[PDB]
Point group: D3
Chain length 161, copies 6
C-alpha cells in the first residue's frame, strides 16, 4: 500500500529515535576527515566496523552461493583493511538497523572510495530487516586499496510511504 519516496533527515531521525531504526545514531555529520558519518540531508552515512573478510583464490574452490566455505576468505581485524586488487572484502556496519515494515533501504558508496575503484555491492534492505549490514566492497582497481574502520563507508537512502 502506498508507493515509496526517498525520505529526509528529519524522518530518518524520528525513526531512529522512536523506533530504534538505526543504533548507534548520530544526528549530524561527525568524525574527522573526508570519511565522516552520521545523518545527511537524505540519508545516513554508516561506519565500517573493524572485522573484515578478505577473499583470495588460495584454496581453488568454486564458490557456491548456496554453501558458504571458510576457505574462500581470511579473517582480519584492525583499524584498516587493505583490499587486494581485483578482489573483495566483507565487513559489517558499526550501526545496527531495524527496518520498519513500511520501509526499504538502498545502499550507496562514498565518493572518496568510489573514485579509487571501490564498488559497494550491498543489495536493498527489505521491510522488517534487522541486523548489522554486511558491506561488500569490491576493489575493481589493479592496485590494493586501503579502507578505514570506524569511519564512514557508505550511505543508506530510506524509501517510505
Amino acid at each position: 500500500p502506498g508507493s515509496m519516496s526517498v525520505m529526509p533527515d528529519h524522518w530518518i531521525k524520528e525513526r531512529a529515535l522512536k523506533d530504534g531504526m538505526i543504533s548507534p545514531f548520530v544526528d549530524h555529520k561527525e568524525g574527522t576527515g573526508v570519511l565522516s558519518y552520521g545523518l545527511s540531508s537524505y540519508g545516513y552515512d554508516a561506519r565500517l566496523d573493524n572485522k573484515f573478510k578478505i577473499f583470495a583464490n588460495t584454496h581453488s574452490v568454486v564458490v557456491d552461493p548456496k554453501n558458504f566455505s571458510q576457505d574462500s576468505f581470511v579473517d582480519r581485524e584492525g583499524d584498516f583493511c587493505i583490499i587486494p586488487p581485483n578482489s573483495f572484502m566483507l565487513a559489517k556496519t558499526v550501526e545496527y538497523f531495524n527496518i520498519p515494515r513500511d520501509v526499504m533501504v538502498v545502499c550507496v558508496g562514498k565518493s572518496t572510495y568510489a573514485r579509487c575503484g571501490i564498488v559497494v555491492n550491498v543489495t536493498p534492505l527489505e521491510p522488517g530487516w534487522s541486523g548489522y549490514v554486511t558491506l561488500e566492497f569490491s576493489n575493481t582497481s589493479p592496485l590494493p586499496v586501503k579502507v578505514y574502520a570506524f569511519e564512514g563507508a557508505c550511505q543508506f537512502l530510506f524509501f517510505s510511504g
Copy 2:
C-alpha cells in the same frame, strides 16, 4: 508528467495481470531454497534462464561496444553456469517484460549472490521497453562463482506516477 515513486506488490500484480507487464508471473514467493523468485513487497524477483555467455580473453580483441564480437565470449547452456574469476556473464531472464509508457524499472541483486562478489550491472528499463532482460553478472571475486538457472537472480523495482 508526474514524478515517480517505488510501487508496491499490488500495483505490480495489477500491471502484470492486466497489462502483461511481467510474464510468466507468480504472485508470491516461490521456489525451493534461498534463491526464491516471484512477487515481493516492493519489487519482483526474476529468474535466471539457462543460456549464458561467458567472457574470456582467449582471442585478444579490444571490445568495441558499438560492434559486438562473437570472439569475446563462449556460449554455455545448462542448469548452472560458473563465472570465472574477475570476468562476467550475460544471460536473459526467464520473465518477459512489457514496461508501460508510465514506468521505469531498476534492477538490483540478491544478497545471496552479492555477498559472493557478484555485481548485477543491469541499467534501468525505460518506459515502453519490451523483452527478456539481459542480465550482466560481474564476478568481482578472485574465485569462480556458481549461478543457478531457473532460480531467483535479481530484483526489479518499479517506479511509476
Copy 3:
C-alpha cells in the same frame, strides 16, 4: 522537508534553463549512433569528455583514499580511451552540473557499455553540488574495452520534492 521522487523531463528542462542545473543542455536526444545524449523521459544522458585517467599497477603503491597519488594512473587525452581489463578509468562529464538544495541525483550506466562489463560507479550528487561529474568506469571484463569521448556515457536521474 518533503520526500523525493524521480522527476520528469519537463522538470529537468525547467531546472536546466532557469536554474543552470545542467550546462550545456540539449532538450532532446542528440548525436549519431547508439551512444546518444541529452534529455530523456526521466533523466539526462551525459557525455564523456576527452580526458581520462587510466589506472595501472606499475608503481606498486597501496592506494590510500585519503591521499591521492599520481603514480596510480596515467593521463590520456583523445577521442576514445581503452580501459584495460579488470581496471578502471576516471573521466569528467562534458556537462557542468549545479544541483539545487532541493535535489539529489543518481547516476546509472547505458546498456551499450554495461553489456560489455563496464560498471559505472558514480555515487549520488548531493543537494548543492556543483561541478563536472567525475565518472568512474570499472572494466569488469577480462578484455580491454573502448569508450567514446563526446558521446553518451551515463544517465542522471533527478530526485526532488
Copy 4:
C-alpha cells in the same frame, strides 16, 4: 658423459641419421631458423592451443581436459596475457639412444616476456616437439608460425 655438440655434428646426424627433418644447414630468415654454431633453431608450426579459464576446471596433469584450451590455426597466434600456448615444431626429431636435447628460447621472444618451457628430450625420443610458450607479460603477445621459435642444444 655428455657435452654440447657443434654444428658439424648436428649436420652429420641430421643427414646421415635423420635426427632433424626437414633440415637446413644455415640461418634462414629477427626470427631465423636452421643450423646455428652450437644448436638448431626449430620452427613453430601453425596449430595452437590457447589456454583460458572459461570453464573453471582444476587442471589435472594426469587427466588433461579439452575444456582448458581453444584450438587455433593460422600464420600467427596471440598468446593472452598471463597465459600460455601449446604448439608443435615444424621439424620432426629422431633423438638417438646416444643423445639428450635441451630447449631454449630465442631472445626476440624472451625479451617480450615469453618463456619457453620445454623439458629435455631424452635419448631415443622420436616426434614433433610440443612447445610450451608461457606469456609472463601483462599484455597479449604475438608469435609467428613457420619462423624460428626456440633453439635445441644437443648433448652427447
Copy 5:
C-alpha cells in the same frame, strides 16, 4: 671443466658417497621418479607453501614475509592460477665439492604451464631442495606429493 654425467656415475655417488638419499636405481611409477639415463627424477614431498596476495605486501627477497603464503600439507597441492608454490624434495642431497646440479621440469607438468624455477645446486651443497613451481596458466593446476616432480642433471 664439467659435463653431464650418466646414470652409472650418479649410481656410484648415490651409494658410495650418499649424494642422493633415498636412492632408487630405476624409474618407479606419467610421474615416475628415480634414476634416469642421464639424471635423477626427484619426488615432491607433501608440504607446500602456496602464495597469495591476501595481505598486500611487497615481497622483499632480503626479508621474506610469512604473510606472503599459506602452508598446506597433503597428498596433492593445487597451485592457484598465475601464482606459485614452494615445496621440498623428498630426497636429501649431498653435492660433492666436485659437482654442480641443474634442475629441469617433467614434461607432464610443463605441458600444463608449470615452470620449475630451481637454480643450480653449487658444489658442496647439502640439503632437501626447495622446488619452486610457477603456475603460468590461467587455471589452477594439481601437483602430486610423493611422485616425480623434476629431474636433476649432474655436471662434473
Copy 6:
C-alpha cells in the same frame, strides 16, 4: 664440443681477453656478485623497464612498442605481480668466437617467484646483457640495483 668451464678459465679470459668487465675474482657482498666456482654472478644495473597493460597493445616481437612499459631508474625496482621487467647487467661482456654462455637465476630471487628468462649468449656476442625478470608471483617483488642478479655459465 663444449663443457662448463671452471673459475680459473673465466678468470683468465676476463683478464687476458676482457670477456667480462668490470671483473671481480671472488664473491663480494644474500645477493653476492663476482666469480663463482663454475660461473660468474653479474650485477643488475639501475635502469629498468617495467611492463604494464595500460595502453592495451598486442605486443609484436618484430615491432616492439614504447607504450608497453615504463622507464624507471633507482637503487631498486618493484616488479608488479604477474608482470616482468627488463634491465641490463652492470657488466660488459665480450664472448669469444669460442664460447656460449647460459644464464641462470639466483636462489634468493627464484624463491620469490622471479624467473630469469635470458637466452644464451652466442659465440662472438659483445654487449651489456638484457636481463628479463618475470615475476610469477601474485605479489609485487623488490629487486636490487648493483647487487647480484644472475649467474652466467660459460660453455667452451
